[PDB]
Amino acid sequence: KETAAAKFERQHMDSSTSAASSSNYCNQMMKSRNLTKDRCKPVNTFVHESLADVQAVCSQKNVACKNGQTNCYQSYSTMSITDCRETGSSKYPNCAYKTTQANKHIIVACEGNPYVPVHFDASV
Ligand SMILES: [Cl-]
Ligand SMILES: [Cl-]
Ligand SMILES: [Ir+4]
Ligand SMILES: [Ir+4]
Ligand SMILES: [Ir+4]
Ligand SMILES: [Ir+4]
């Protein structure tokens, strides 16, 4: 079935655009990446850097994950991200999102051989 690594890419990678400069971006992307299929995924971040750059974070600053696991990593540089957060009037299946562009350090959980991002933990 879909690998954890591929699912991270689907949920969190958007290297095509340098920043999400449409107010529509989250509405469209959350839909087209299948994050509105069974429910409205409430919060989700997209990263606008190369895959190589994001994968490389697994070799950067080791930090605790929010769930208490130890396999999280914080990017030494800031990265261009977009935060998508479901609006108060959003109702499945017409999931509605606020789009916020930022430049922040990402924190991702990594696992496997090869050791790759499998979860987006936080941005700081
Ligand atoms: Cl499959
Ligand atoms: Cl910084
Ligand atoms: Ir399969
Ligand atoms: Ir898209
Ligand atoms: Ir910093
Ligand atoms: Ir997770």
Short mmCIF file of N, CA and C and ligand atoms in Angstrom, two decimals:
data_model
loop_
_atom_site.label_atom_id
_atom_site.label_comp_id
_atom_site.label_asym_id
_atom_site.label_seq_id
_atom_site.Cartn_x
_atom_site.Cartn_y
_atom_site.Cartn_z
N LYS A 1 0.86 -1.21 0.00
CA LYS A 1 0.00 0.00 0.00
C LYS A 1 0.89 1.25 0.00
N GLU A 2 0.35 2.47 0.11
CA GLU A 2 1.20 3.70 0.07
C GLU A 2 2.26 3.62 1.16
N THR A 3 3.51 3.87 0.84
CA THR A 3 4.55 3.92 1.90
C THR A 3 4.39 5.15 2.81
N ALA A 4 4.96 5.07 4.00
CA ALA A 4 4.96 6.23 4.91
C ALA A 4 5.72 7.40 4.25
N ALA A 5 6.80 7.09 3.54
CA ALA A 5 7.59 8.14 2.88
C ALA A 5 6.79 8.82 1.76
N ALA A 6 6.12 8.01 0.95
CA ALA A 6 5.26 8.55 -0.12
C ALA A 6 4.09 9.34 0.43
N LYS A 7 3.50 8.88 1.53
CA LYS A 7 2.42 9.62 2.16
C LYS A 7 2.90 10.99 2.71
N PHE A 8 4.11 11.02 3.27
CA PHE A 8 4.73 12.33 3.68
C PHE A 8 4.85 13.23 2.46
N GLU A 9 5.33 12.70 1.34
CA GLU A 9 5.44 13.51 0.13
C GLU A 9 4.09 14.04 -0.37
N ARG A 10 3.08 13.18 -0.35
CA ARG A 10 1.74 13.59 -0.73
C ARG A 10 1.16 14.62 0.23
N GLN A 11 1.30 14.39 1.53
CA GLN A 11 0.71 15.32 2.48
C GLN A 11 1.45 16.61 2.65
N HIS A 12 2.76 16.60 2.40
CA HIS A 12 3.58 17.74 2.87
C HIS A 12 4.53 18.39 1.92
N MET A 13 4.78 17.79 0.76
CA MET A 13 5.72 18.37 -0.18
C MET A 13 4.96 19.14 -1.30
N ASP A 14 5.34 20.38 -1.52
CA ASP A 14 4.98 21.09 -2.71
C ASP A 14 6.11 21.99 -3.21
N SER A 15 7.07 21.36 -3.84
CA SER A 15 8.26 22.04 -4.37
C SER A 15 7.94 22.84 -5.63
N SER A 16 6.79 22.62 -6.27
CA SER A 16 6.41 23.39 -7.49
C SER A 16 6.32 24.93 -7.41
N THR A 17 6.00 25.46 -6.23
CA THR A 17 5.82 26.91 -6.06
C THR A 17 6.66 27.34 -4.89
N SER A 18 7.21 28.55 -4.96
CA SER A 18 8.18 29.04 -3.99
C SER A 18 7.47 29.48 -2.70
N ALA A 19 6.19 29.84 -2.84
CA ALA A 19 5.30 30.26 -1.75
C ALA A 19 3.89 30.17 -2.28
N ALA A 20 2.91 29.98 -1.42
CA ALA A 20 1.55 29.80 -1.90
C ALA A 20 0.93 31.16 -1.93
N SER A 21 1.09 31.84 -3.06
CA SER A 21 0.50 33.14 -3.26
C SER A 21 -0.82 33.01 -4.04
N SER A 22 -1.70 32.10 -3.61
CA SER A 22 -3.14 32.22 -3.81
C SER A 22 -3.86 32.02 -2.47
N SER A 23 -4.81 32.90 -2.17
CA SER A 23 -5.75 32.68 -1.06
C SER A 23 -6.52 31.34 -1.21
N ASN A 24 -6.57 30.80 -2.43
CA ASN A 24 -7.26 29.54 -2.75
C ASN A 24 -6.39 28.30 -2.49
N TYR A 25 -5.09 28.50 -2.27
CA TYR A 25 -4.10 27.42 -2.38
C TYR A 25 -4.49 26.22 -1.51
N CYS A 26 -4.80 26.49 -0.25
CA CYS A 26 -5.15 25.38 0.69
C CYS A 26 -6.42 24.64 0.33
N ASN A 27 -7.45 25.39 -0.07
CA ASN A 27 -8.68 24.76 -0.54
C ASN A 27 -8.44 23.79 -1.65
N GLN A 28 -7.59 24.18 -2.60
CA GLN A 28 -7.31 23.36 -3.76
C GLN A 28 -6.40 22.21 -3.40
N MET A 29 -5.32 22.52 -2.69
CA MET A 29 -4.29 21.51 -2.36
C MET A 29 -4.75 20.45 -1.39
N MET A 30 -5.43 20.86 -0.32
CA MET A 30 -5.99 19.90 0.62
C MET A 30 -6.93 18.94 -0.11
N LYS A 31 -7.71 19.47 -1.03
CA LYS A 31 -8.53 18.57 -1.87
C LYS A 31 -7.73 17.64 -2.78
N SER A 32 -6.85 18.21 -3.59
CA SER A 32 -6.13 17.45 -4.60
C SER A 32 -5.08 16.47 -4.04
N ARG A 33 -4.64 16.68 -2.80
CA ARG A 33 -3.74 15.70 -2.15
C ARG A 33 -4.48 14.68 -1.30
N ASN A 34 -5.81 14.67 -1.40
CA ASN A 34 -6.67 13.71 -0.75
C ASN A 34 -6.75 13.84 0.72
N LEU A 35 -6.63 15.07 1.19
CA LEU A 35 -6.71 15.35 2.59
C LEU A 35 -8.11 15.78 3.01
N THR A 36 -9.07 15.70 2.09
CA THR A 36 -10.47 16.02 2.40
C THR A 36 -11.41 14.86 2.01
N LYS A 37 -10.85 13.66 1.86
CA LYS A 37 -11.55 12.54 1.24
C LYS A 37 -12.54 11.92 2.20
N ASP A 38 -12.09 11.56 3.40
CA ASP A 38 -12.92 10.92 4.41
C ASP A 38 -13.37 11.87 5.50
N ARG A 39 -12.60 12.92 5.72
CA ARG A 39 -12.95 14.01 6.63
C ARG A 39 -12.14 15.26 6.23
N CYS A 40 -12.41 16.39 6.86
CA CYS A 40 -11.60 17.59 6.61
C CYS A 40 -10.37 17.50 7.54
N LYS A 41 -9.21 17.19 6.99
CA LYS A 41 -8.00 17.16 7.82
C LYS A 41 -7.90 18.57 8.39
N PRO A 42 -7.90 18.73 9.72
CA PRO A 42 -8.00 20.08 10.34
C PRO A 42 -6.81 21.05 10.15
N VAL A 43 -5.60 20.49 10.18
CA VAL A 43 -4.39 21.30 10.05
C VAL A 43 -3.39 20.53 9.19
N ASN A 44 -2.71 21.23 8.31
CA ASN A 44 -1.69 20.58 7.47
C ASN A 44 -0.71 21.55 6.85
N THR A 45 0.56 21.20 6.85
CA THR A 45 1.59 22.07 6.31
C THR A 45 2.20 21.52 5.05
N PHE A 46 2.38 22.41 4.05
CA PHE A 46 3.12 22.14 2.85
C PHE A 46 4.45 22.87 2.81
N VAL A 47 5.47 22.19 2.32
CA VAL A 47 6.85 22.67 2.32
C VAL A 47 7.28 22.90 0.87
N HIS A 48 7.76 24.12 0.63
CA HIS A 48 8.19 24.58 -0.72
C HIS A 48 9.69 24.66 -0.81
N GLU A 49 10.30 23.51 -0.68
CA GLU A 49 11.73 23.33 -0.86
C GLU A 49 11.87 22.08 -1.65
N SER A 50 13.05 21.81 -2.20
CA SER A 50 13.32 20.56 -2.88
C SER A 50 13.14 19.37 -1.93
N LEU A 51 12.76 18.24 -2.49
CA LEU A 51 12.75 16.99 -1.71
C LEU A 51 14.10 16.69 -1.06
N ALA A 52 15.21 16.91 -1.80
CA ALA A 52 16.53 16.66 -1.24
C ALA A 52 16.72 17.50 0.04
N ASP A 53 16.33 18.78 0.00
CA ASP A 53 16.50 19.63 1.14
C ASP A 53 15.69 19.15 2.34
N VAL A 54 14.49 18.69 2.06
CA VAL A 54 13.62 18.26 3.14
C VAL A 54 14.13 16.93 3.71
N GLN A 55 14.52 15.97 2.83
CA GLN A 55 15.06 14.70 3.29
C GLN A 55 16.31 14.91 4.18
N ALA A 56 17.11 15.92 3.85
CA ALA A 56 18.34 16.22 4.52
C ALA A 56 18.11 16.64 5.98
N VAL A 57 16.90 17.10 6.28
CA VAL A 57 16.56 17.54 7.63
C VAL A 57 16.72 16.33 8.62
N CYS A 58 16.59 15.09 8.11
CA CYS A 58 16.70 13.88 8.94
C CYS A 58 18.10 13.71 9.49
N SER A 59 19.04 14.53 8.99
CA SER A 59 20.44 14.53 9.39
C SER A 59 20.80 15.80 10.16
N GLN A 60 19.81 16.61 10.47
CA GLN A 60 20.01 17.94 11.11
C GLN A 60 19.70 17.89 12.60
N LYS A 61 19.05 18.91 13.17
CA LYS A 61 19.05 19.05 14.63
C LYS A 61 18.03 18.08 15.28
N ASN A 62 18.51 17.14 16.09
CA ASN A 62 17.62 16.13 16.67
C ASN A 62 16.89 16.78 17.84
N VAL A 63 15.58 16.71 17.80
CA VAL A 63 14.75 17.30 18.85
C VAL A 63 13.64 16.32 19.20
N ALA A 64 13.07 16.50 20.37
CA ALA A 64 11.93 15.67 20.76
C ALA A 64 10.71 15.93 19.89
N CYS A 65 10.00 14.85 19.57
CA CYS A 65 8.72 14.97 18.92
C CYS A 65 7.66 15.31 19.93
N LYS A 66 6.55 15.88 19.45
CA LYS A 66 5.43 16.26 20.28
C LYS A 66 4.84 15.09 21.07
N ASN A 67 4.86 13.92 20.48
CA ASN A 67 4.36 12.71 21.15
C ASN A 67 5.39 12.06 22.10
N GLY A 68 6.55 12.65 22.26
CA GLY A 68 7.56 12.13 23.17
C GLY A 68 8.59 11.20 22.57
N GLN A 69 8.39 10.76 21.32
CA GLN A 69 9.43 10.01 20.61
C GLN A 69 10.62 10.92 20.35
N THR A 70 11.74 10.30 20.02
CA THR A 70 12.99 10.98 19.97
C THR A 70 13.48 11.19 18.53
N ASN A 71 12.70 10.80 17.54
CA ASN A 71 13.15 10.74 16.14
C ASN A 71 12.64 11.95 15.36
N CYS A 72 12.67 13.13 15.98
CA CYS A 72 12.33 14.36 15.24
C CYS A 72 13.58 15.19 15.00
N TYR A 73 13.50 15.99 13.93
CA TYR A 73 14.62 16.76 13.45
C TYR A 73 14.17 18.13 12.98
N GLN A 74 14.90 19.16 13.43
CA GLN A 74 14.57 20.55 13.13
C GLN A 74 15.57 21.11 12.09
N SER A 75 15.04 21.74 11.07
CA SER A 75 15.85 22.24 9.96
C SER A 75 16.73 23.37 10.50
N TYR A 76 18.00 23.35 10.16
CA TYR A 76 18.90 24.45 10.58
C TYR A 76 18.54 25.78 9.88
N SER A 77 18.18 25.71 8.61
CA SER A 77 17.69 26.91 7.92
C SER A 77 16.17 26.98 7.99
N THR A 78 15.66 28.20 7.81
CA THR A 78 14.23 28.40 7.62
C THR A 78 13.87 27.89 6.21
N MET A 79 12.63 27.41 6.09
CA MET A 79 12.08 26.96 4.83
C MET A 79 10.77 27.66 4.55
N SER A 80 10.50 27.85 3.28
CA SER A 80 9.22 28.39 2.80
C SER A 80 8.12 27.29 2.99
N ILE A 81 7.14 27.59 3.82
CA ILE A 81 6.02 26.68 4.08
C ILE A 81 4.69 27.38 3.86
N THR A 82 3.66 26.57 3.69
CA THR A 82 2.30 27.03 3.83
C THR A 82 1.52 26.22 4.85
N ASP A 83 0.93 26.92 5.82
CA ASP A 83 0.06 26.34 6.82
C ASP A 83 -1.39 26.40 6.32
N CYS A 84 -2.08 25.25 6.32
CA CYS A 84 -3.50 25.20 6.01
C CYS A 84 -4.27 24.83 7.26
N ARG A 85 -5.23 25.70 7.65
CA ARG A 85 -6.05 25.47 8.84
C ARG A 85 -7.54 25.68 8.53
N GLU A 86 -8.30 24.65 8.84
CA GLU A 86 -9.73 24.60 8.53
C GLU A 86 -10.46 25.79 9.22
N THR A 87 -11.32 26.46 8.46
CA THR A 87 -12.11 27.60 8.98
C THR A 87 -13.19 27.11 9.95
N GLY A 88 -13.74 28.03 10.74
CA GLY A 88 -14.82 27.71 11.66
C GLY A 88 -16.13 27.32 10.96
N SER A 89 -16.36 27.81 9.74
CA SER A 89 -17.57 27.49 8.96
C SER A 89 -17.38 26.37 7.94
N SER A 90 -16.18 25.79 7.88
CA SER A 90 -15.94 24.61 7.04
C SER A 90 -16.79 23.39 7.40
N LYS A 91 -17.52 22.84 6.42
CA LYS A 91 -18.33 21.62 6.65
C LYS A 91 -18.13 20.57 5.56
N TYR A 92 -17.56 19.43 5.96
CA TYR A 92 -17.34 18.30 5.11
C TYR A 92 -18.63 17.96 4.37
N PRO A 93 -18.62 17.70 3.06
CA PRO A 93 -17.41 17.52 2.24
C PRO A 93 -16.81 18.81 1.63
N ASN A 94 -17.33 19.99 1.99
CA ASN A 94 -16.88 21.25 1.39
C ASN A 94 -15.90 21.85 2.37
N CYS A 95 -14.75 21.21 2.45
CA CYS A 95 -13.77 21.60 3.42
C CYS A 95 -13.12 22.94 3.04
N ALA A 96 -13.07 23.90 3.97
CA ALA A 96 -12.58 25.25 3.70
C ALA A 96 -11.41 25.57 4.62
N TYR A 97 -10.41 26.21 4.04
CA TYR A 97 -9.13 26.45 4.74
C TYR A 97 -8.65 27.88 4.61
N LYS A 98 -8.05 28.37 5.67
CA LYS A 98 -7.19 29.53 5.59
C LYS A 98 -5.74 29.15 5.21
N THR A 99 -5.21 29.87 4.21
CA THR A 99 -3.87 29.74 3.67
C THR A 99 -2.90 30.75 4.31
N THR A 100 -1.87 30.27 5.00
CA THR A 100 -0.85 31.17 5.56
C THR A 100 0.56 30.73 5.13
N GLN A 101 1.21 31.61 4.37
CA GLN A 101 2.60 31.49 3.99
C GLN A 101 3.53 31.93 5.14
N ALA A 102 4.62 31.20 5.33
CA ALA A 102 5.63 31.61 6.32
C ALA A 102 6.98 31.08 5.95
N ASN A 103 7.99 31.57 6.67
CA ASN A 103 9.35 31.02 6.53
C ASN A 103 9.80 30.62 7.88
N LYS A 104 9.87 29.30 8.13
CA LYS A 104 10.15 28.82 9.45
C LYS A 104 10.98 27.59 9.37
N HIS A 105 11.52 27.19 10.51
CA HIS A 105 12.19 25.92 10.62
C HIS A 105 11.14 24.84 10.73
N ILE A 106 11.35 23.79 9.98
CA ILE A 106 10.43 22.65 10.04
C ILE A 106 10.96 21.64 11.02
N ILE A 107 10.04 20.88 11.62
CA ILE A 107 10.39 19.72 12.44
C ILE A 107 9.61 18.52 11.84
N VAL A 108 10.37 17.51 11.42
CA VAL A 108 9.84 16.28 10.82
C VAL A 108 10.31 15.05 11.61
N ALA A 109 9.51 14.00 11.64
CA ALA A 109 9.88 12.72 12.26
C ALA A 109 10.46 11.91 11.08
N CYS A 110 11.55 11.20 11.34
CA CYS A 110 12.18 10.39 10.30
C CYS A 110 12.26 8.91 10.77
N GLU A 111 12.20 7.98 9.82
CA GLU A 111 12.23 6.57 10.09
C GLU A 111 12.69 5.82 8.85
N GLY A 112 13.23 4.63 9.04
CA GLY A 112 13.52 3.70 7.94
C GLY A 112 14.96 3.64 7.54
N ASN A 113 15.17 2.69 6.64
CA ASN A 113 16.38 2.62 5.87
C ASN A 113 16.00 2.63 4.37
N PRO A 114 16.22 3.71 3.61
CA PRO A 114 16.90 4.93 4.05
C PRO A 114 16.05 5.75 5.04
N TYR A 115 16.74 6.59 5.81
CA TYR A 115 16.14 7.35 6.93
C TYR A 115 15.54 8.62 6.39
N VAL A 116 14.23 8.67 6.32
CA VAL A 116 13.50 9.70 5.57
C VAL A 116 12.32 10.29 6.35
N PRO A 117 11.83 11.48 5.94
CA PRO A 117 10.70 12.04 6.69
C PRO A 117 9.48 11.17 6.47
N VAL A 118 8.77 10.91 7.55
CA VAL A 118 7.49 10.19 7.53
C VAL A 118 6.35 10.97 8.21
N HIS A 119 6.63 12.08 8.92
CA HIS A 119 5.59 12.85 9.59
C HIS A 119 6.08 14.30 9.74
N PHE A 120 5.15 15.23 9.61
CA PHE A 120 5.41 16.66 9.82
C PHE A 120 5.00 17.04 11.23
N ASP A 121 5.96 17.33 12.13
CA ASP A 121 5.63 17.52 13.52
C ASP A 121 5.24 18.95 13.86
N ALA A 122 5.98 19.95 13.32
CA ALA A 122 5.80 21.34 13.77
C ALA A 122 6.64 22.25 12.97
N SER A 123 6.33 23.55 13.05
CA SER A 123 7.24 24.54 12.52
C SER A 123 7.51 25.52 13.63
N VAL A 124 8.69 26.09 13.64
CA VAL A 124 9.11 26.98 14.71
C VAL A 124 9.91 28.15 14.13
CL CL B 1 -0.86 0.10 -3.84
CL CL B 2 16.54 31.26 12.05
IR IR B 3 -0.11 -1.68 -2.53
IR IR B 4 -1.22 21.80 -6.46
IR IR B 5 16.10 30.30 13.74
IR IR B 6 2.03 11.08 12.38
#
